Amino acid sequence: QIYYSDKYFDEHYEYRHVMLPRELSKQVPKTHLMSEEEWRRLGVQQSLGWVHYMIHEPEPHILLFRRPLPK
Amino acid sequence: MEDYTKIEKIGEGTYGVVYKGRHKTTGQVVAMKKIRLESEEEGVPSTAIREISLLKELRHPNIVSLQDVLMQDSRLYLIFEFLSMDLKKYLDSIPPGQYMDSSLVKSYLYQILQGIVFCHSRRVLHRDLKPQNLLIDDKGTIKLADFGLARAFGIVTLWYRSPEVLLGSARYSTPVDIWSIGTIFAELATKKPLFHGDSEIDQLFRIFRALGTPNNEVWPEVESLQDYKNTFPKWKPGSLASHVKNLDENGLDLLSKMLIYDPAKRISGKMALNHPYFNDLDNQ
Ligand SMILES: Cc1ncc(-c2ccnc(Nc3ccc(S(C)(=O)=O)cc3)n2)n1C(C)C
Secondary structure, rough: OOOOOOOOEEOOEEEEEEEOOHHHHHHHOOOOOHHHHHHHHOOOOOOOOOOEEEEEOOOOOEEEEEEEEOO | OOEEEEEEEEEEEOOOOOEEEOOOOOOOOOOOOEEEEEEEEOOOOOOOHHHHHHHOOOOOOOOEEEEEEEEEEEEEEEEEEEEEEEEHHHHHHHOOOOOOOHOOOOOOOHHHHHHHHHHOOOOOOOOOOOOOHEEEOOOOOOOOOOOOHHOOOOOOHHHHHHHHHHHOOOOOOOHHHHHHHHHHHHHHOOOOOOOOOHHHHHHHHHHHHHOOOOOOOOOHHHHHOOOOOOOOOOOOOOOOOOOOOOOHHHHHHHHHHHHOOOOOOOOOHHHHHOHHHHOOOOOE
């Protein structure tokens, strides 16, 4: 199963990481960040406008997400 | 060896199974660590039995004395003084509402630093320090177990790990053990882990959220490290005392000095023993 972390926040962004099972992790690009279309094909389900902003290389199964706070 | 008798299993360590046993001659109760030795290439001598014999010669009241070392049938047996409780277990025996006695926290931290200074002075690291590796007798003495075993072999774990290691620094040294003693100091006081992360990346973010996201201003050359990113969340430094309770101003000062980002600027074991926190230290 796919696990969704609680939200945490900055002064500018709100954040949330998502842990995929390790057999799906071989399907996550080791070279570029992902479009909202791309990460939905892996079965990640959440609201619009979350952006895949970085890769921690030791844990390719962990998708890190970020969305700007409104002003 | 035929000199000892297994009583019962006590647990699994990383390196092998651990039993409680008795010496047939003395009647002394012991811990026995069985290790199955890996097959080795001919024309490549093993450091492992050599390095383990060196550790037998380390004596200090606050480390777990390696009393002997046996070899029967390609299996290595390590024999230690038996202690029946560890710090993880001690903290669990304290009920909700109660906290560890203010003076016993001080005593334990003093003992832990004494043991780590002894190892560090003899050029030996733990590297893997955590409540399960801190054993206690009924008389209120505390000792490091598994010192130097990591180097001898390898080529809940995450909470006590230092930011050097997490960010992928090429090299590391004695300060890694000081960071760990830091996070354990806080746990003795509060009963709960200071940095309770679910992954390497979450562990960093919890460290950042309490001590500030590091940059080159507070930690020289950090922005060059293998797993640094300019995109990390950006929390400001300050508000360590909001994450911890039951510590006077000296305690908080020592703690903050054990948790400095730069390994070079971080407090040493020697210096920590002279800190004001220990001035009013107590019987046992
Ligand atoms: C990895 C290792 N190598 C040698 C030991 C070791 C050395 C001396 N005494 C003990 N005794 C002990 C520890 C923990 C517990 S418990 C069930 O309360 O967790 C019960 C008895 N153990 N150890 C320990 C750290 C397992």
